[PDB]
Every structure is written in C-alpha cells, then in structure tokens.
C-alpha cells in the first residue's frame, strides 16, 4: 500500500506501508528520505496530528492517502 | 454529501456540499457555521493549500473527507 | 499551560489552560477564578476579539501569553 507524504511547498514523497504500520514506523521511513528526525516530524491527516503509538489503520488512512508533514521544534 | 472541517486543535464540524462546490463556496459555508470570514480562512487538504477558484472535485475531496482549517491572523 | 489575563488597569490573573481549550472554556476558567460571568467577558489578543468557539491554538496563542480582558 502506497501513501504520499507532502510538505505544503515540498515535493510529494511516496512510501510503501502496511495499514498496521505505526506512525512511528512511517516517521522512521520519512527520516530516511528527508533527514528529519522522527521527534521533529509531525504528520497531519484529516486535520489531526497523528500520534506515534497508533497505526495507519487507526486513522483510517488508506491507499493513495496524502499525509501532511510539518516540522515540529521546541520553542516558546 | 457531507465533508468535515477542522482546525488542528479544534473539534470538527460538518458541511453539506456538492462536488461542484468551489472552495470559495466552502469558505462561505464555514462563515455561516463558524462566523469566520472567508478571507480569514486557509484551507488545506492532501498537504496542499486549496485555491478559492477550484472546486472540491478538482482536489478529489470525497464524501466525509476532512479539510484542515488554519486561521489567517493579523496584528490589530 | 500557563497564560495570563489582564484588564488594562487590573490585576493580572494566571490561568491553567490547554492549547486546545476553547475561548468559551477560558472564560469559564476566568469565571471560576474571578467570579466574572462569561457573558460579561471579552478577551482580546493582538488587538482582536477572540471568538468563543475557537481554541487558544487556533489563535496561535503560546504559553505565557497575556490576554486582555474587557468587560
């Protein structure tokens, strides 16, 4: 199952995932492609931050879904 | 058809829409339900900002998709 | 998260809020602390009135921000 991950301005990247993959597992794959550490990625789908212990299936993320990648930094 | 609209931290609302509805029309529906003027709304789906002139079908936004709402904020 | 609420000439009140708390909830907390009915409260940040159905994070309000309370 392929999903897409995209920043607002950036290029779409394509990942092969299983519906049972955890968000942590997806972030590990994003780190391999874009270099951003998992703890500084946040993935947004359906207007919700995707929590790391949960699976793609939990959020009803299906084939061809596009996750929104934002950069999360400690500040303020 | 119903779609959902949600800010990152807020609870979701639903709008009654048609595939041919423009993003402009969607923003008008949001104003009707939430009191946010269309020019204070930034809408995101599939990691893309949605353009006012396009329609929902133009973005492959389907029944029970959730748009991500971000406010446009200005000092004063 | 800690935020502050001030009238222009009044005491500063500190509130415990969550980023996802709605302005309505924030007014409820001010009622609990200060005894001001929410219908008498207007909250302002960056010169703009904050609407009841929005959250603190909707308005990009960070920790230790000061909201201005007008009655």
């Amino acid at each position: 199952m392929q999903i897409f991950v995209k920043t607002l301005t950036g290029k779409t990247i394509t990942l092969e995932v299983e519906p049972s993959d955890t968000i942590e597992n997806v972030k590990a794959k994003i780190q391999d492609k874009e270099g951003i550490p998992p703890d500084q990625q946040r993935l947004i789908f359906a207007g919700r931050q995707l929590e790391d212990g949960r699976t793609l299936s939990d959020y009803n993320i299906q084939r061809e879904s596009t996750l929104h990648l934002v950069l999360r930094l400690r500040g303020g | 058809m119903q779609i959902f609209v949600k800010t990152l931290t807020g609870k979701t609302i639903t709008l009654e829409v048609e595939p041919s509805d423009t993003i402009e029309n969607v923003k008008a529906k949001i104003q009707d339900k939430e009191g946010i003027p269309p020019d204070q709304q930034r809408l995101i789906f599939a990691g893309r900002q949605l353009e006012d002139g396009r329609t929902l079908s133009d973005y492959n936004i389907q029944r029970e998709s959730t748009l991500h709402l971000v406010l446009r904020l200005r000092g004063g | 998260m800690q935020i502050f609420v001030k009238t222009l000439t009044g005491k500063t009140i500190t509130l415990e809020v969550e980023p996802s708390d709605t302005i309505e909830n924030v007014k409820a907390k001010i009622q609990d602390k200060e005894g001001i009915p929410p219908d008498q409260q207007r909250l302002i940040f960056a010169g703009k009135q904050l609407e009841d159905g929005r959250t603190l994070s909707d308005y990009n309000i960070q920790k230790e921000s000061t909201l201005h309370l007008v009655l």
Partner: nanobody, 119 residues
C-alpha cells in the same frame, strides 16, 4: 517560494550579521514566524520567534545577542556577538502552535542561508 532567506556569509567571531527572509503572499498570516538553524552533525534547533502580536522569544543560547523582527514583507534576524557555535544553516519558517505546550509546528520553511563564524 513563500520564504527566501538571505544575508548569511562568513563573519569573524564577535561580529554581527543580519539575516533577511523575503516573505511572499500571505505567509505572515499564519501568525508566527521563526528562525531555526542546523549546525553540522546536529539537529535543527529553534533560534527565535515572533508572533502576530509582536511577541518574541529566543533560544537560551542566543537571548540577548539575537533579535527577531519583521517589516511589511521581510523577517529579520539581527545576530550580534557571533560565536563559532552559531555556525549553521539558518532557516526562516512560518507556523502555528499545536496540542503540546512549548512546541511550534512550522508549515513552511525556506531553503536556508549559511552562516559561518570563524576565529
């Protein structure tokens, strides 16, 4: 390109440098702009932020040395008393607070400007 950094370069320790970020469209209307940096072999680190109320905040390691500001179409980072450890690629970004206190979600960020502080 919504955000374009410039004004980097090579500067001697103790010197000063002003970074600029040209902001296009309505990128400011997210309500929060920031600078973060990435030094060699290190993770990205928040440096300074400013919200639409004009409120600023700074990393502890730059507080008192760096000043963030913005005009109608530019975010600035005035960097005084530069130190070798300020060497990094510096990025401007626009974003929002999230569900957890003390974190910023940057939705847009630039390509970066290199700052090198020599001795």
């Amino acid at each position: 390109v919504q955000l374009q950094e410039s004004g980097g370069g090579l500067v001697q320790a103790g010197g000063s440098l002003r970074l600029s970020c040209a902001a296009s469209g309505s990128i400011f209307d997210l309500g929060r702009m920031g600078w973060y940096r990435q030094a060699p072999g290190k993770e990205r680190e928040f440096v300074a932020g400013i919200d639409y109320g004009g409120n600023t905040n700074y990393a502890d390691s730059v507080k008192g040395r760096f000043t963030i500001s913005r005009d109608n179409d530019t975010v600035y980072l005035q960097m005084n008393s530069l130190k070798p450890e300020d060497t990094a690629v510096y990025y401007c970004a626009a974003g929002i607070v999230g569900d957890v206190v003390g974190w910023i979600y940057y939705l847009y960020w630039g390509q970066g400007t290199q700052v090198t502080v020599s001795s």
